[PDB]
Amino acid sequence: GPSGMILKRAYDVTPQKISTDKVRGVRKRVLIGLKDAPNFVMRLFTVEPGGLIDRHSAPWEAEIFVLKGKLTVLKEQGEETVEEGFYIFVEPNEIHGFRNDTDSEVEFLCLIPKEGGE
Amino acid sequence: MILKRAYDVTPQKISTDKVRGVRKRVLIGLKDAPNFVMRLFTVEPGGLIDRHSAPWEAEIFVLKGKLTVLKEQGEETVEEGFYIFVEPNEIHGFRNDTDSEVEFLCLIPKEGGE
Ligand SMILES: [Cu+2]
Ligand SMILES: [Cu+2]
What we know:
Number of helices of chain A: 0
Binding site for Cu(2+) 4 (chain A): 62, 96
CATH topology of chain A: Jelly Rolls
Binding site for Cu(2+) 5 (chain A): 94
Radius of gyration of chain A: 14 Å
Largest sheet of chain A: 9 strands, antiparallel
Order of helices and strands of chain A: EEEEEEEEEE
CATH architecture of chain A: Sandwich
Bound molecules: copper (II) ion
Distance between the termini of chain A: 19 Å
Number of domains of chain A: 1
Oligomer: homodimer
Shape of chain A: globular
CATH superfamily of chain A: Jelly Rolls
GO molecular function, one term (chain A): metal ion binding
Binding site for Cu(2+) 3 (chain A): 58, 96
Largest interface: A-B, 41 and 38 residues
Structural class of chain A: mainly beta
Strand content of chain A: over 45%
Number of strands of chain A: 10
Organism (chain A): Thermotoga maritima (strain ATCC 43589 / DSM 3109 / JCM 10099 / NBRC 100826 / MSB8)
């Protein structure tokens, strides 16, 4: 592929609304997307207050790093709190979801293999 | 599902002829990762990762401080809230010219090891 290095403020990317049957109150910035990624993509998710990614699973793994705020992680059995400075590894096919139970925005990085899109 | 405070992962000190004043935490390593690994680097004041290149890409997010990025020629300083995409084979390195620790997340395909 091409040469070089991209160096960019993540907030230069506009946060786009995600609205699906299972997601509400979430925006996403694609940082390193399909147009560039040899293997895996980097997105920055913003969960608005009360925002919800309902429990689901995917056939690929996810790697998450929490940048800002206090995030409720939905698990097959129950839920757990994480905050800025936590990482999360979601195995392929593992049930997971997220909710923001606070009154300020939560931000997290989420990376998936590029076969799962951006 | 693994949920952990990154700080609680024990950092590995690196001090070699090419890397000094750097600590590395393997957050998501080879034992867990099907495809790519997640590391968190801390660069002490004056710390250096000298110029090098790899056959794989790197995806970085700057978490704390002002990171000086070495390029094939010259350098560029960025700060917390920047992401960096290093193409495969691109010469790169890092330095911390500030008086406080700099931290960045770095992910590579698992062929790059942990
Ligand atoms: Cu998911
Ligand atoms: Cu490197």
